[PDB]
Design a protein around this ligand. Structure first.
Ligand code: A1BPF
Ligand code: ZN
Length: 140
């Protein structure tokens, strides 16, 4: 579980979005596993605007933050799960690390701010849904 809180926006994994999120929808993309809903109160997360490939992510299944090197956002095959059929997920970055069901929503951060959130796992890899291209998160 986990979310990003920036301005009047809440960014969560689309597959974990609640009834309150769909009832206050701003934007969603199934191919990216992202959903953004509106909030009443202003958030304090800063979204990174950079091309960093090293950062630190939170792993809830270990109660630990791990420093990782991660790949550039790309179209990557993700196996079928209870949430999506087998498909290419876009804007996804991989790192070598631990990610289990329950870890989605953990933040990945670099020196510039929030880079993305955990979206995939297994086989000793962790995948993060990038949010650095969503420039509109910083305005209105
Ligand atoms: N974005 C997606 O399509 C993911 C939806 C949730 C399940 N996905 C995973 O990668 C798995 C996982 C392991 C750790 O966290 C998640 C489930 C076993 C691997 C795929
Ligand atoms: Zn950065």
């Amino acid at each position: 579980s986990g979310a990003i809180y920036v301005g009047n926006y809440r960014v969560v994994n689309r597959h974990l979005a609640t009834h309150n999120d769909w009832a206050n929808l701003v934007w969603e993309d199934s191919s990216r596993d992202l959903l953004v809903s509106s909030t009443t109160a202003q958030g304090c997360d800063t979204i990174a605007r950079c091309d960093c490939q090293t950062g630190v992510y939170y792993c809830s299944s270990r109660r630990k933050h791990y420093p990782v090197s991660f790949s550039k956002p790309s179209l990557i095959f993700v196996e079928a799960s209870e949430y999506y059929p087998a498909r290419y997920q876009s804007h996804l970055m991989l790192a070598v690390g631990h990610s289990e069901p329950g870890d989605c929503g953990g933040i990945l951060r670099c020196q510039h701010g929030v880079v993305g959130i955990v979206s995939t796992g297994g086989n000793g890899l962790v995948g993060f849904a990038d949010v650095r291209d969503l420039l509109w998160l910083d305005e209105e």
